């Protein structure tokens, strides 16, 4: 299942968190592109 979780901070940023991998990653997933 798609564990990516978006995050939007008040700092004005999106950033997609995979809550399975433990995955960080200010740039989105191939998912989601």
Same mark, same amino acid.
């Given at each position: 299942?798609? =564990? #990516? ?20 990653? #200010?740039?989105?997933?191939? =998912?989601?592109?």
């Amino acid at each position: 299942v798609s =564990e #990516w979780t978006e995050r939007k901070t008040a700092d004005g940023k999106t950033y997609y968190y995979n809550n399975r991998t433990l995955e960080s990653t #200010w740039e989105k997933p191939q =998912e989601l592109k």
